[PDB]
Amino acid sequence: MQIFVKTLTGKTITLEVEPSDTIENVKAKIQDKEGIPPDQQRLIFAGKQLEDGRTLSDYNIQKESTLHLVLRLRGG
């Protein structure tokens, strides 16, 4: 199934996923398409940050849903 991941700009990353994919798998697919390391990615759906160790079906994320990608700013 297709899902969409909008960034801050409003650019869309379109991914092919299964509902059984983990959020960690999704972050890996974003790294393969965009080069963004998973450790910096925060994935938001229904205003909630998703946990890497759970699946899209855990979060009832159905086909053609839109998530939001936030990049955690580095501390210092």
Place this chain on the structure above:
Amino acid sequence: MQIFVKTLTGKTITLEVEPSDTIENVKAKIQDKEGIPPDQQRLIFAGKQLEDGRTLSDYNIQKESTLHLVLRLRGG
């Protein structure tokens, strides 16, 4: 060696550090004295924001140098 960390409120925290200390180590030292979580801390030297991975040596921070601490807190 001694360095000084100034807060917005005007308080000066005096810290014992070494050139090998990473910025993360300095943030840990501030937590030990003031109980501020390191992820809420941002350190500044000569107007420049510091990064977690580097050392005091990398920034040529000397003994009796002054740092600035800004608190990345969340308001509701």
Place this chain on the structure above:
Amino acid sequence: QRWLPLEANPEVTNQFLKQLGLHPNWQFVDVYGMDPELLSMVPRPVCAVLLLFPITEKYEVFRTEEEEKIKSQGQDVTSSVYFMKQTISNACGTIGLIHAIANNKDKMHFESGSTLKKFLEESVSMSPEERARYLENYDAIRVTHETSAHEGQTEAPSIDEKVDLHFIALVHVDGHLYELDGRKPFPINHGETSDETLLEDAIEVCKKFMERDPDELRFNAIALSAA
């Protein structure tokens, strides 16, 4: 209705203003200290200060006597102050930005489809209680606040967590310094000021918040500065 608390961080608030359609000729910057040496380092002019401070018992003591004096004495609030009340928990970050932009809108430049422009257009003649309800119902700002709440160098807390920190805005309107806090029944008049000394006059009000709460370090001030 409960929102997530925003990080006191110029990169968070500047990106939030960009999503609301504000053109970036004004940008928040950090304020590192309150002595004039440090302040003379913030780019000029400054048109607003946002202050994060802790809601302690000593605060809410000064807070309740400040209110009752103004109810009796009846201060100076021109009708051209834009003031809105807070009726959403943890919305103070957005209300602070709105207070900042709305009381300076002529200096502000908005972009095509700017959601903040449309909100200020529609709310210009509402009562402060009406504006609070309008914010409750305004989907575009609620959505943008929520994604912005996940930005920053810290992770967003859980929505149920108690928050003991609060944002307010300090601005200059008609030759006076106003503190705008949506938790209070009206703007607070803090004396005389101008566009050219707002930063130093605002920081003097910040100074008083801190000296009332001398053991607290949990303060952050950001300045809305020409860029």
